[PDB]
């Protein structure tokens, strides 16, 4: 279960459940858009158009929606 203080998993779990199209920005400023299919403490599985990406959280800067 997710604690009220853990806003990261609350957000990721909602993105996952709702299949929302999210934009992931990386440390170098580049971005990819897709649906978060699964995630854990180290990685995020992002389903994009014609591409499947396995992203390390250590390389992520930001998530944004819309």
């Amino acid at each position: 279960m997710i604690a009220n203080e853990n806003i990261q998993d609350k957000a990721l779990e909602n993105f996952k459940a709702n299949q929302t199209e999210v934009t992931v920005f990386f440390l170098n400023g580049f971005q990819m858009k897709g649906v978060i299919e699964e995630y854990d403490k180290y990685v995020v599985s992002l389903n994009s158009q014609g591409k499947q990406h396995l992203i390390y959280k250590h390389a992520i800067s930001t998530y944004t929606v819309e």
Copy 2:
């Protein structure tokens, strides 16, 4: 703790802050929520969930 107290104050006061990232890019907004690892910044009408590992500076 300096950081925990600063973020608590930014959220409570709805302080406008510019977040600078490690690569030098910047985003100005209001911190709506935060936790030990991420900050949720509302900027230009949209929410951004930012990892603290990617933040360089908060400019007040």
Copy 3:
């Protein structure tokens, strides 16, 4: 477990994987082996031992 499952799938199927590094450079090759810290990627006739700390994404 997500990571090991994907990496084992790439290795078992000799899948053409494009590795994006932290600086944004990309290298397309085949994963020959991997462990908790590194991945061995064969690309254009050369062997590359890559630290996972330097990887941003694996794309197929």
Copy 4:
């Protein structure tokens, strides 16, 4: 502690310190406070809360 002793000195003496970031940018100002994870640097009329993980070097003249 080398680091704690320098920051202690910069703060007490209000030294003009130039902080270099990992990306090479630099910011010159005065250290107002610091702890294990952050440094607060006043520069050109504004407060800056800087993560030590993003700092490369402190340079003083």
Copy 5:
């Protein structure tokens, strides 16, 4: 441990290896020593003590 086995062989056999860094720069030489955190690389009239945290890739033929 792929990395330790690889580094052990590179050192024992004086393998010419190219080290790429996180910023994409590269340096070719021979690994003379290494431990959990650093690699000592001899390259063109220079000795380089490199932190593994700054290494992206080791390439060999």
Copy 6:
């Protein structure tokens, strides 16, 4: 310990060390002091307190 042995040598011999940072910038100077997390480097008259997390390589001739 490879790292400590090297830094001990550099400090004891006032060796001209070029420190390369993660972003590729370099600074040539003399190691005056160091510890687990930082290195103090004198260069062109100024003192620099550098975080090892921001260092890529120590290079010497």
